[PDB]
């Protein structure tokens, strides 16, 4: 797996789940083309979006709607989304920290 | 003024000095307008891009350029950019801090939204 | 002022206003004891804890409770408080700002460390 | 496994591996006592600290050595440590980001 997505809540102290997420590649003529996408796992993650074939050198977006996932839960967030965006040239876990007001994004980048 | 950026330095625990960044509008046509732009000073802080009447309701994008700023320092940073994208003052006026904090590979943004 | 405390609230988008905190210093014995204590204002700062004169070498720890803060909004929090621990003035004086943002299973701290 | 820690570096985009930590509980005379501690694995994990009979609830601290992990990566650190203080009163996990000068934490608490 190339490329998870990991997502924590921290007003309930849980897995983010059911937040919904698409993926972009950068393409020449510098617009972004789908790539993937998905919906977090009761465990907050989001694994298979892509192959280690399919996942080549490139300027991906991870566009996370954390608007609706604050929206579901009844709570205003300052947000329209979470936008992780990142040169690929590995295994890759982008974690997502999120509050209705602010969020953390980290990589954790490993070699297989 | 009713926007206003703070970034921070993780690593060197130090405001983060000369970070471009540039503020988008979201158009009637769903594209991103060029808004406004400008660098950290030495604080830190980027004050006066915009005035209040100008900045009317909408969705606006804020990305700062921490990409070239890690590279200015000799570190290869995991991300292209940090990016804040938010509807503002669809309640009325509002007055917004985003903060920013910055490490290689991790980045922590926030907003203080207050009425004038 | 040598030493300055900025705190957050990352569920409201706003100062943390109010937030009670502690500040000790370690002794020779190893024993923490108290320094100085205050709470954050209406812009979440807390300043004047301490002069030059006073804020000497040694290791500080910064105890903000954060716990009646989230229990007064009427929320039940993870942590007991945010704590900060450092070695304050070991190269000589320093200006430090300690920025807590909050929410209620989570806390983020940083250091903006000035030479003056 | 009632209790998890998990450290990152936020500086490397890796596991914070072998992070020495402590963990501590509160004792009717106001001090800590004492109760675990180990080192985070090569995933920055540090799993079975305790059972399910022994972590009665209470007041624990998990005490994180940055200091030594920044130390032995030759870069000066803001914090003599990460200290992690909850009332516990379910399955926990604790992880912590870290930077030089900063760091951030926060818990995942899940009903088993
Ligand atoms: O550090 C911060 C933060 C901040 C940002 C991200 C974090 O994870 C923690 C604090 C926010 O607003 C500020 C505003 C300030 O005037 C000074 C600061 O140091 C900060
Ligand atoms: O919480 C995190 C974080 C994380 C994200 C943002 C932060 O501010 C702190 C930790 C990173 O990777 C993980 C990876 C995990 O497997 C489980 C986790 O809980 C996390």
Same mark, same amino acid.
């Given at each position: 797996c190339p490329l998870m997505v990991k997502v924590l809540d921290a007003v309930r102290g849980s897995? !983010?789940?059911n937040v919904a997420?698409?993926?972009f590649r950068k393409a020449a003529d510098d617009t972004w083309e789908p790539? !993937?996408?998905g919906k977090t796992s009761e465990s907050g993650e989001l694994h298979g979006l892509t192959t280690e074939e399919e996942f080549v050198e490139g300027?991906?977006?991870v566009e996370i709607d954390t608007k609706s996932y604050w929206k579901a839960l009844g709570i205003?967030?300052?947000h329209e989304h979470a936008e992780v965006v990142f040169t690929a040239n590995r295994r890759y876990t982008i974690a997502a920290l999120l509050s209705?007001?602010?969020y953390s994004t980290? !990589?954790?980048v490993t070699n297989p």
């Open positions: 897995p !983010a789940i997420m698409h993926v790539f !993937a996408s300027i991906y977006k205003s967030p300052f209705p007001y602010s980290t !990589a954790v």
